[PDB]
Amino acid sequence: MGPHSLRYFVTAVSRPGLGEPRYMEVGYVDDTEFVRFDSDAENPRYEPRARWMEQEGPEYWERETQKAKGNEQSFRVDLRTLLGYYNQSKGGSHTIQVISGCEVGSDGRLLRGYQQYAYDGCDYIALNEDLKTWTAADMAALITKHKWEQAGEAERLRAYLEGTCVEWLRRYLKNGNATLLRTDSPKAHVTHHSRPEDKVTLRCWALGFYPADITLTWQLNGEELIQDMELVETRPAGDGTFQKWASVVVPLGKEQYYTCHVYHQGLPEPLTLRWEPP
């Protein structure tokens, strides 16, 4: 089973002179997008991003939608507010971001509820592990701190995080579980490429896998080639699966001395493979 999470990623970007700020909320269950609200529409509504969510009635969508629109205008005001804290021109683009959510264990109990904010890509403030007190990241954030004490909102948020947030996480898990648990094994293979003089490049490819977490290693007879092995960041195929590779430069004629090891959560056992000159 493992632990589970319900997380909302929220962005508000000012664009003075170009219209209203762009506002975006993305809901994630277990790091997989399931709801999205985009302000860039004539009738912007909360919408489903995973098939299993179409299970929810029009009541749920209106309610979520309504919360989002009110969050958007609240952030619109926050944009102007921060222009004051920092003494910034009213003419430049600024960004507020929020991550808000709960992680629960296999038991179903709170593992860590939380809520951090960011201004212009930098930590602003954040509810601590203890859902009681705030960590302001700078002088301006110190203001928001009081305003959220004198107004009492760090308990209000605790209720949400330990209650409705957890209850709905369960609810979502129950409906999406079969789709969430989806696993795709990587298909691996090795490719061979030239290189100045008497060296060649061996590239080990892992394709079509999910989740994205994965590990590619190269071995010279049972030692892992730690240093100068080249590897790209895991990347979207664009179809729901991921691709990765890892490559090493080896002596010409010594290709059969190297082994690529592919470790992935969905394989019976790690893949082991070598260059295959056809």
Binding site: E64, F75, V77, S100, W148
Partner: peptide, 8 residues
């Protein structure tokens, strides 16, 4: 579901 964010 989602929560309401406090005015900053």
């Amino acid at each position: 579901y989602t929560v309401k964010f406090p005015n900053m």
